[PDB]
Subunit: 142 residues, 4 copies
């Protein structure tokens, strides 16, 4: 039913280079799958009400997760920084559900969100197509 | 002393369709870990023994299968689950191997190879070509 | 009306080692083209008939093979060259199919399938599962 | 003998998103091969005196090539923009050899080079490790 395509823009050499180290899919709304093409990561979801997380690890050992999904028919996103080596996407993704602590972030149904880690790395998520079933967003490191 | 499990996937029959990875999870025990890819091989680096990771595949015939790889008591193991539901993702499967989640048995068996055939008739075999040391390797085969 | 050739690679025997793509070229006739990848498949989009492209593979046993795919006279063709030299790259191979470069014959045969065995003993078969239309598909098989 | 590893930094959303559409290897110095890992593209060359080219196509139809290699034991690079659809890496790469027209660019043995296409896209190539056998460089779109 829904589709979120992501393209990553690493704009600052000083942050090191980030690469995806995990790709999870939440089991609500009939699950879904991750796919990639032309550098664009797509999360196809079986309906409104589930999500996916992409965890990145930079060349300087920084760990960050990007959470994207659809809540009550409106896209939502989140970015968590300064993650411990054992705080995986498998650990993070479930926290937005069944009162795991981040549920309220999801319900916000944000079309854009940005954060700067404690070590200075700014991560943004902005939806370039925030409406419809074929959503698109950019993930910007700076 | 961390651990690494490198996987190379072999697809042998156009019969069962073409499978592609649709998800990759890392368990949180043993200080976690990460998935990497290079020269067509998938590596799961683990911060030691006691954790694992899962690759979820989807064929062009709509089939969904998962491959679990990890280290139990400094001796590798593997597992394959077939005929998965669309909402039966790796987040549902990977945890079942721990906390009496349903598959702890399989993990404890510390297998260095495993095979099974989905009801749909697809066979998947995981075989560790390097089943000892801190750099284990294995091949994932579809047929 | 451009052309697309989608390739899915099947590796069947740990014997011949594991091959990985080490180069991808596009011939410049027919307004060129581009290589793309998605869901584990490789597509060569061509600005019409009269051009082709090459994938160069390298196994873990140091073997070097190339797969040529293109369209000749609105009818697909393919070719496989084995036992290539380290300096016998796809830039050396792809051009030989034109300008009386040495392999124009093969291209003209407009094959919808082809097989061969390198002296080292590795077999490679390219078979077009969709050999007609503007969206041709084929499987590259190693064994 | 030599190795050039590249990481791509697409810093400006306004340029569209670039993705590699061709990867060629020149046959001099015993050829070589292209490999990738953690978003880093590596060109392993059988010796000093050959090169490789990466051609990119953006979401807005822009075509550009990045040429990297080792000449007389010193790395070199080049970027050609505004390429026609039939001006492929296979067409471009050979032009730096046997007096193909770009030979002089190669002989410069540049450790850094930047150009701005006719449509405003600036492409830079800067070597972060310009010495040794394990060279490294960043490709920056802006």
């Amino acid at each position: 039913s829904y589709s979120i395509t992501l393209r990553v823009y690493q704009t600052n050499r000083d942050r090191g280079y980030f690469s995806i180290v995990e790709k999870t899919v939440w089991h609500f709304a009939n699950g879904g799958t991750w796919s990639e093409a032309n550098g664009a990561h797509t999360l196809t979801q079986g309906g409104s009400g589930t999500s996916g997380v992409l965890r990145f690890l930079s060349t300087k050992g920084e760990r960050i997760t990007v959470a994207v999904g659809v809540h009550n028919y409106k896209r939502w996103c989140d970015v968590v920084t300064g993650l411990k080596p054992d705080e995986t996407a498998l650990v993070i993704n479930p926290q937005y559900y069944n009162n795991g602590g981040r549920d309220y972030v999801r319900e916000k149904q944000l079309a854009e969100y940005s954060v700067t880690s404690a070590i200075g790395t700014k991560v943004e998520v902005v939806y370039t197509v925030a409406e419809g079933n074929n959503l698109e967003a950019n993930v910007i490191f700076s």
